[PDB]
C-alpha cells in the first residue's frame, strides 16, 4: 500500500498508472487490469500525465483580436497563439494583443520599434523610482527634500520620492 511511483496515482489501494498526454481516463486500474485511457478529438488536448476524464478544447486565435496561430495544437499540446506583427502578445498566454507592453511601477524603459514588439524595461537603479505604468517614461530621481525640508520616510523604485517632512 501507499507511496506510489511518479507516472502512477493511487486509488482505493491500487497503484494505477496515469494516462499519457493526449489520452483521457475511462477506468481506474484494478488488480488485474491497467488504467483504461482513450485519446482526445483533434479539437481537444491533454497537457500532462493525468487522471482527468474530459479533454481541454484548443485555444483559438481570433484574428479580430489580432491573434494568429503560431504552433498548431496537437492531442497532447494546446494551440500556441501569436500576435499580428506590429503588436505583442498581452501575456505569456497568447490571449490578447497589445501594441506594446507598459513597464510596471518599479521599472523604467529602453523603447519599442517592432518586430521588437515590446518595450524592454529596466529595474529602477538606486536613487531612482517610477510610479505609474508607462510605455515611454524612464525611472526618475528622488526629490531632494533638503531644499527647506527634511526627509521623513524614503522612496525607492516603486515609492514616491521620499515623502517628507519637515525638521530642518
Amino acid at each position: 500500500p501507499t507511496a506510489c511511483r511518479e507516472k502512477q496515482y493511487l486509488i482505493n489501494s491500487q497503484c494505477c498508472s496515469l494516462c499519457q498526454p493526449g489520452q483521457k481516463l475511462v477506468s481506474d486500474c484494478t488488480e488485474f487490469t491497467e488504467t483504461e485511457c482513450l485519446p482526445c478529438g483533434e479539437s481537444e488536448f491533454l497537457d500532462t500525465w493525468n487522471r482527468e476524464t474530459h479533454c481541454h478544447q484548443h485555444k483559438y486565435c481570433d484574428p479580430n483580436l489580432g491573434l494568429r496561430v503560431q504552433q498548431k495544437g496537437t492531442s497532447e499540446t494546446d494551440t500556441i497563439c501569436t500576435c499580428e506583427e506590429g503588436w505583442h502578445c498581452t501575456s505569456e498566454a497568447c490571449e490578447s494583443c497589445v501594441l506594446h507592453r507598459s513597464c510596471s511601477p518599479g521599472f523604467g524603459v529602453k523603447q519599442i520599434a517592432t518586430g521588437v514588439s515590446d518595450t524592454i524595461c529596466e529595474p529602477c537603479p538606486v536613487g531612482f523610482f517610477s510610479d505609474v505604468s508607462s510605455a515611454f517614461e524612464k525611472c526618475h530621481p528622488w526629490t531632494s527634500c533638503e531644499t527647506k525640508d527634511l526627509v521623513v520616510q524614503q522612496a525607492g523604485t516603486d515609492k514616491t520620492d521620499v515623502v517628507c517632512g519637515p525638521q530642518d
Partner: nanobody
Amino acid sequence: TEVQLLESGGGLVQPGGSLRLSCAASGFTFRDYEMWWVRQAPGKGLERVSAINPQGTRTYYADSVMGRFTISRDNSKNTLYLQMNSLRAEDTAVYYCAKLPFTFDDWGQGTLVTVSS
C-alpha cells in the same frame, strides 16, 4: 468596447505645410491615461510617432518627427492633439491615436495625411 476616440483634421498638404490632428476621446477617465500617436502606411508599415503622459509634463517623440511635430492634450476638453509642422513626403500616412493598455478597443478610427506636389 465603450472606449471611443475620434480623429479629426487630416488631409492633403504641400511640403513645408502644417496640420493639427485632433483625437476627441470619450468613454474613459482620459485624464488618467498615457496616450500615443502612431502612423501606418502601405510599405512604411506602422511607426510609433509620439507619446504623452496623462498630465502632459512628459512627452516622447520618434527621432524622425522631432522638432517638427508636437504632441499635446486638453484634459478638460478630453482631446489629444498633434501639431505637425514643416511637413515632408515621408509623413504621408494614416495616423491613429491610442489608450494605455493598447488593445483593439483602445484605438481611434484614423485620419489620412498625404503631401505630393
